[PDB]
Design a protein around this ligand. Sequence first.
Ligand SMILES: Cn1cc(C(=O)Nc2cccc(-c3cn4ccccc4n3)c2)c(Nc2cncnc2)n1
Ligand SMILES: [Cl-]
Ligand SMILES: [Cl-]
Ligand SMILES: [Cl-]
Ligand SMILES: [Mg+2]
Ligand SMILES: [Zn+2]
Length: 312
Amino acid sequence: LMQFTLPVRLCKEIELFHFDIGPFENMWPGIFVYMVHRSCGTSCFELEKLCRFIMSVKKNYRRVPYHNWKHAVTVAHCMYAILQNNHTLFTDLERKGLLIACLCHDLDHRGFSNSYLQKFDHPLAALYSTSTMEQHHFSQTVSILQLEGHNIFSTLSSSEYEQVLEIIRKAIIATDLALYFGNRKQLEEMYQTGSLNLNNQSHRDRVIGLMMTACDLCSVTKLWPVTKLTANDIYAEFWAEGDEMKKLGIQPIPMMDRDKKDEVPQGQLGFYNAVAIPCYTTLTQILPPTEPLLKACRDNLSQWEKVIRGEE
Ligand SMILES: Cn1cc(C(=O)Nc2cccc(-c3cn4ccccc4n3)c2)c(Nc2cncnc2)n1
Ligand SMILES: [Cl-]
Ligand SMILES: [Cl-]
Ligand SMILES: [Cl-]
Ligand SMILES: [Mg+2]
Ligand SMILES: [Zn+2]
């Protein structure tokens, strides 16, 4: 067999949750295949179909500051670290489906929120009334799978193919942050009443949802230097959308106004307290080995406070 291998430093550090995939774009496909081979197995996919699929997915990500091919692979690596540390809890189909779900989860992102597409009156908002971009991302995933020689699931039966596509669809739709607030609340009550049951499919669906949120936001779980630089990338997108909202004659929300630039540290504080810490807290309750994500999130929250007090 031709096994995929990484340089020594990458081979060791890829197992850490806070791993950064680096600036060499041409290594990212090899990094993804390595993760698939180790978390799924070397017989999950035909290597030639998987490589053709990877390159079609890369080509349908756009050159935007944050919602780009690097984000896709970074999110898949977070999912890799969760699966390797909880390797008894997931099925064959779930392992196959979830790494692909993560690679495809922001396909053809234009750097604009669902709100902007609705205010602009974009055709996609007419086609998909809720979770607009997320239904588009999944539609792009299915288009790519249906290209000649791109069916990486061609050995599965009809019923198995239908199950894995249904895992991918739910996982991608769950990356809509508007849905996360209700999903984490339900998982929080379910956990505290002792009713959460990982054999209940509708409960698995909620846990995979939260895992997809945790993977999608994993830029706040990196070492401070990575997290700080990545914050510049998301704001570059937010501020461009704010400019576009002003052009429609609409006042943008504060996180999208480039004039409120000096309030970024306080904005981050609110984001960590309202969104990220609760996300990684509930996830650590359900999947205790995902502790290092919560720990690294708390450390970054402390760094932003040190910024606000004018020490950083
Ligand atoms: C997907 N995603 C969303 C956020 C995020 O920060 N959202 C957010 C949420 C709530 C409030 C504010 C907020 C209010 N404000 C008021 C004035 C100025 C600024 C400001 N920001 C921002 C994010 N960040 C991030 C950070 N570091 C690395 N990767 C990603 N990634
Ligand atoms: Cl390169
Ligand atoms: Cl482009
Ligand atoms: Cl085929
Ligand atoms: Mg998205
Ligand atoms: Zn994303």
